[PDB]
């Protein structure tokens, strides 16, 4: 029944491609080595045709180079500072939900052009001294067009419909599942166009590349208090993508990022490969040659 279903739930081992034994091929007409990169196709040549191979029954597992496994790992996507001391005694902050803020997660996600995933969001919250007192905090997801709070105690924190999460800093970090929320059929890290009609003749073309299909509202975070607590709270937001489909692979970014929502690079072009003295120089000592033949 559903018992047999639980039995076959452990991730099974898919092995890599085996090698077959091969011998010498002294004939004309058959040329596996010769390819044509011009055609745009990768070489079809196997080890067995270029050299004499033995039979290897390869048992190495490939299950971990999956878009599921690659991306199903929580990474820092935002740090919200709930300032309630000195000049900033607001005791609330509204943080625009974007995942393009930190390199490690940004660069992974930008391997794809389009991605459709559910995410799991964890809120690791603490004070300046890494201490977690019994201090109550409200995390309210504000979808695009929901009114954003303008004060510590405003009507917007009633949350009749907005999903919110009450937790103490003292408690283990809050976590929630979020669905694939997007008008478009998949998210889209690169949008080559403008969201509005117009002629786009501005000394600063900000609008270029900004698709609102991705912009998924704000998280409003406050300390549920009556007055200034005199304490700042750091909220590290961790996103773990799941149920992930990805389309159209792209080159991994080489240049350091400069701004959040725009691919832009310093005019100093850092080379993709770390340079060396000459094209015939390798950094490997090796052993003492037996016949110096």
């Amino acid at each position: 029944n559903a018992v047999s279903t639980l039995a076959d739930t452990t991730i099974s081992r898919v092995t890599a491609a085996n090698t077959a034994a091969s011998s010498h091929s002294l004939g004309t007409g058959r040329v596996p080595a010769l390819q044509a990169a011009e055609t745009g196709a990768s070489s079809n040549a196997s080890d067995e045709n270029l050299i004499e191979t033995r039979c290897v029954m390869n048992r190495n597992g490939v299950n971990e180079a999956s878009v599921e496994h690659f991306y199903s790992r929580a990474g820092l996507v935002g740090v919200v500072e709930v300032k309630d001391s000195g000049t900033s005694q607001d005791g609330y902050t509204v943080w625009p939900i974007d995942v393009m803020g930190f390199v490690q997660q940004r660069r992974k996600l930008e391997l794809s052009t389009y991605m459709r995933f559910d995410a799991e969001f964890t809120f690791v919250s603490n004070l300046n001294d890494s201490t977690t007192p019994g201090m109550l905090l409200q995390y309210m997801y504000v979808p695009p067009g929901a009114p954003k709070p303008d004060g510590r105690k405003s009507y917007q924190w009633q949350t009749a419909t907005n999903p919110s999460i009450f937790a103490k800093l003292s408690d283990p970090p809050p976590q929630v599942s979020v669905p694939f929320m997007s008008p478009a059929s998949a998210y889209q890290w690169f949008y080559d166009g403008y969201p509005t009609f117009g002629e786009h003749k501005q000394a600063t073309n900000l609008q270029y590349g900004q698709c609102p299909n991705n912009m998924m509202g704000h998280f409003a975070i406050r300390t549920v208090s009556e007055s200034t607590t005199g304490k700042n709270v750091h909220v590290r937001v961790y996103m773990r993508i799941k149920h992930v489909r990805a389309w159209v692979p792209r080159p991994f970014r080489s240049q350091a990022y400069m701004v959040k929502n725009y691919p832009t690079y310093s005019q100093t072009i850092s080379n993709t490969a770390a340079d060396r003295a000459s094209i015939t120089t390798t950094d490997y000592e090796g052993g003492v040659p037996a016949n110096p033949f």
Partner: protein
Amino acid sequence: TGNIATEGSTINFTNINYYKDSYAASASRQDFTQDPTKFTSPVLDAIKEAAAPLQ
């Protein structure tokens, strides 16, 4: 045939959804697919390994 690195299977009470929304479920990583051709050999005329590609 698991990642246990020794003989043993045990009992597998895992991959359970406790919520009415199915997107609340654990990462769907039961299935692995490897179709590389759409990127490595996208040409119309499939080229055999042996044959010299352009003639």
